């Protein structure tokens, strides 16, 4: 069955940076976009970013653009989110996801995340 191992989190202060890292089980990433949602205290979902491997092609929302970027090693069947010039707001717990051509969540069940505290 598919797997998406995550690691990366971590505690640091406001201006830090955290490296998160998504690595597949059961598939290869060339075969997907890869990328992260991020759930906040008291919000819902918020899809942070997201990749093709196979070309690079890379989307950001607007509230990370120039802060975070999304990269992928395909020799590791990995995936990373570099987030530079973290903010407070950036606390939540962070996870990796796959989405079809569609645009849609592409894995049965969510992984356990990893947890991004800025203070």
């Known amino acids: 069955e598919v797997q998406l191992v995550e690691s990366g989190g971590g505690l640091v202060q406001p201006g830090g940076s955290l490296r998160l890292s998504c690595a597949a089980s059961?598939?290869?990433?060339?075969?997907?976009?890869i990328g992260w949602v991020r759930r906040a205290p008291g919000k819902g979902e918020e899809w942070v970013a997201s990749?093709?491997?196979?070309?690079?092609?890379?989307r950001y929302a607007d509230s990370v653009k120039g802060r975070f970027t999304i990269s992928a090693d395909t020799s590791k069947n990995t995936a990373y989110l570099q987030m530079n010039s973290l903010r407070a707001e950036d606390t939540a717990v962070y996870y990796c996801?796959?989405?079809?051509?569609?645009?849609?969540?592409?894995?049965?069940?969510w992984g356990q995340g990893t947890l991004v505290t800025v203070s």
């Open positions: 990749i093709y491997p196979t070309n690079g092609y890379t």
């Open positions: 059961g598939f290869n990433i060339k075969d997907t976009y």
């Open positions: 996801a796959r989405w079809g051509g569609d645009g849609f969540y592409a894995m049965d069940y």
